[PDB]
Design a protein around this nucleic acid. Structure first.
Ligand SMILES: [Zn+2]
Ligand SMILES: [Zn+2]
Ligand SMILES: [Zn+2]
Lengths: 113, 47, 137, 66, 45, 263, 49
RNA sequence: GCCUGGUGUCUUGGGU
């Protein structure tokens, strides 16, 4: 009667952006990224990757309430680098590692076939 | 209005293919009492 | 403080799901030699003080048929009583309980010891565990 | 009521193994061994078959209502 | 008019309410309405 | 740099070692395979007749749980994304079932093998209820006695496990790492002696025990993740691992797209 | 009713004045009332029914 | 073409 539709976890409303970037002007060079219709699945993957980069000084996320499929990430970088650009770099690295990883599994799989 | 209480099928949206009954037809936005889960939804007339 | 987290996928596969059944009974009453209530689908023109819910799920015999989903305040048994001294009857129908829904499962029709008509309507629904439901070892 | 299609806890299909389990018990195998032969290794799957109660055999005895 | 079913012998027949409530075949006095013409859908969840 | 070494393999389960990756990537792969790898599953049941002893939605509920061959599901669209009026051949598979018991004695058991595919996006291999062999009757659905009939029409649709667990391609996913606890991520409970009271991992012989003198490597990270992916037969085990990686790529790709478009 | 409207919340038996305190509404799915856990003590409330 | 009424008194079994 008050259960929400389960499909609302991944289907984006038309007036709702998948991604929203705002500044945190209290400290220099810090952004708040709000991710809509996403989980720990995506968030934890990006977070660890980012933390091993030398120019990322702070990265964190929280899922504020499990009944709502969103999370918010906070990302601060040193003066040289722009945070939003650094996020793109983290994304492309992981896409590459998974492409490689998919390739090496296929090769090993035929040998056992 | 001539379509209240008549059986309806939904052809677009997340509830596409489901049976229902027109519970209230005030204007443009209908109230279909869906059969499949125990819920009555607001829905546009194009659907 | 004595709550518990349940695995949503277990609920999806059927854990602790249950059927729920409710039966409604009604019968015709006698007020005189030939003054009896009557099961019918009451016409708005001839019967006063009708209920606010829909009457469109009743068949012509005054009884709803199995397989039809019902929601709260829908009429499932139409019955009238005449007004003493046209436009002579008063509604005495039975609506589904306002907080419930489900499917009509089976409708019994018979007569009672006094010979008047007698019906029972059993409704079934399925209750799926959710936040707030109670469990115990 | 009737054997569940899936194990509640892990999801492995167990609804196709009920007939095979009753036949193995006629041949004198013990319950633990019968489950072993069917390859139900995790104890979540084992509870499903070992503790199900088949009531549908009783409900069918009530001579059909049409 | 309306399809019914005999609780004893399962014969099907109709009644236009004014007929007495019994089975034509065996005289059984417990009868049941047959299911609706309408199609029923369930979401299998 | 990521490396894979497949320890065992067969049609419906792959056991494998995963190495030179981050813990978070191994975990996200675990979650994606359970939750976001699409499959096909019954999602609408039209009951035209059911005079069995089982309730209508009870039978319908069992139908939703029947695993269907989902091999070619990537070319199929979601119902919510199709431009058509009601359903059609591009967004659904239609299945039909009809059983009956003639004779005054015995019981007719209705099995999943009686599900007949009626239409579907030809000639894609999707929609048949999975079978182990050819003489395997499959999953028990109902039981019928004299004059009881079951005649239903089922609509199968593409979906993901986030919406309802019937769309999950996996069952369990076994998963472990560091069988000798060199990283000290757990602090063992014991009564007398921790080593004797805790059983050995089934991968204890795949890594070497810590030496009795050895100092704690505070720089060591988790690095070898052994996992076994079992499936229900709705997808083959090799497809699930491949499509898990593929699905996770598009999700990251979609994030990357949105940043370069918001400026 | 909308976010941050004040409402009076109450559990029987009202043995003392902190059985009735004003909370700020937050509208949420599902059919239970949600309390932050640190207020269970003054209400002598728990979640067993 | 707006308004729109469905009981009571008990008893018993339960919840915190
Ligand atoms: Zn199990
Ligand atoms: Zn008869
Ligand atoms: Zn289509």
């Amino acid at each position: 009667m008050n259960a929400p539709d389960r499909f609302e976890l991944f289907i984006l409303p038309d007036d709702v952006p998948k991604l929203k970037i705002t500044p945190d002007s209290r400290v220099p060079n810090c952004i708040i990224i709000k991710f809509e219709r996403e989980d720990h699945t995506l968030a934890n993957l990006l977070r660890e990757e980012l933390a091993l980069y030398p120019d990322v000084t702070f990265v964190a996320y929280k899922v504020e309430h499990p009944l709502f499929a969103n999370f918010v990430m906070r990302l601060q970088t040193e003066e040289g680098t722009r945070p939003k650009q650094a996020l793109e770099r983290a994304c492309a690295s992981i896409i590459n590692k998974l492409k490689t990883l998919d390739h090496k599994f296929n090769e090993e799989w035929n040998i056992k076939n | 209005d001539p379509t209240l209480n008549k059986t309806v099928k939904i052809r677009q949206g997340g509830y596409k293919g489901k049976i229902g009954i027109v519970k209230e037809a005030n204007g443009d936005r209908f109230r279909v009492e869906l059969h499949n889960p125990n819920k009555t939804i607001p829905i546009p007339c194009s659907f | 403080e004595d709550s518990m987290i349940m695995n949503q996928s277990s609920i999806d596969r059927g854990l602790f799901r249950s059927l729920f059944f409710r039966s409604y009974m009604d019968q015709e009453k006698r007020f005189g030699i030939s003054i009896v209530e009557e099961f019918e689908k009451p016409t708005r023109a001839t019967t006063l003080r009708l209920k606010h819910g829909t009457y469109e799920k009743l068949d012509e015999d005054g009884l709803i048929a199995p397989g039809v989903r019902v929601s709260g305040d829908d009429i499932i048994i139409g019955k009238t009583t005449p007004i003493p001294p046209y436009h002579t009857k008063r509604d005495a129908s039975t609506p589904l309980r306002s907080t419930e829904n489900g499917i009509v499962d089976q409708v019994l029709l018979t007569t009672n010891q006094e010979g008047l008509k007698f019906v029972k309507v059993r409704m079934r629904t399925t209750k799926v565990p959710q936040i707030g439901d109670k469990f115990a070892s | 009521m009737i054997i569940p299609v899936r194990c509640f806890s892990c999801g492995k299909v167990v609804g196709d193994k009920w007939d095979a389990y009753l036949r193995l018990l006629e041949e004198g195998k013990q319950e633990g061994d019968a489950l072993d032969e069917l390859k139900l290794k995790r104890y979540c799957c084992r509870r499903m078959v070992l503790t199900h109660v088949d009531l549908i055999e009783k409900f069918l005895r009530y001579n059909p209502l049409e | 008019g309306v399809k019914y079913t005999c609780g004893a012998c399962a014969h099907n027949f109709s009644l236009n309410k004014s007929d007495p409530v019994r089975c034509k075949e065996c005289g059984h006095r417990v009868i049941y309405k047959a299911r609706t013409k309408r199609m029923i859908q369930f979401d299998a969840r | 740099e990521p490396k894979v070494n497949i320890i065992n393999a067969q049609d419906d389960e792959v056991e494998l070692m995963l190495s030179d990756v981050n813990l978070s990537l191994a975990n996200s792969l675990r979650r994606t395979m359970l939750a976001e790898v699409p499959t096909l599953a019954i999602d609408l049941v039209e009951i035209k007749m059911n005079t069995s002893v089982l309730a209508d939605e009870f039978i319908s509920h069992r139908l939703g749980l029947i695993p269907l061959v989902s091999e070619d599901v990537e070319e199929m669209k979601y119902s919510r994304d199709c431009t058509c009026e009601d359903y059609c051949d591009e967004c659904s598979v239609v299945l039909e079932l009809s059983a009956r018991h003639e004779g005054e004695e015995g019981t007719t058991d209705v099995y999943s093998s009686s599900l007949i595919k009626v239409s579907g996006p030809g000639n894609l291999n999707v929609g048949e209820p999975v079978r182990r062999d050819d003489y395997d009757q499959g999953i028990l659905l109902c039981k019928l006695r004299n004059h009881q009939e079951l005649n239903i029409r089922c609509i199968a649709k593409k979906g993901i496990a986030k919406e309802h667990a019937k769309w999950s391609p996996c069952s369990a996913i076994a998963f472990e790492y560091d069988p000798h606890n060199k990283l000290k991520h757990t602090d063992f409970w014991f009564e007398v002696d921790a080593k004797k009271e805790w059983p050995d991992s089934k991968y204890a012989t795949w890594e070497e025990p810590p030496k009795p003198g050895e100092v704690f490597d505070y720089k060591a990270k988790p690095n070898r993740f052994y996992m076994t992916v079992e499936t229900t037969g709705s997808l083959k085990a090799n497809q699930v691992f491949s499509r898990g990686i593929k699905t996770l790529q598009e999700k990251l790709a979609n994030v990357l797209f949105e940043l370069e478009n918001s400026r | 009713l909308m976010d941050d409207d004040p409402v009076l919340f109450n559990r029987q038996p009202s043995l003392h004045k902190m059985s009735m305190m004003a909370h700020r509404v937050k509208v949420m799915p599902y059919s239970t009332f949600r309390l932050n856990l640190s207020v269970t003590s003054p209400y002598n409330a728990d979640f067993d029914g």
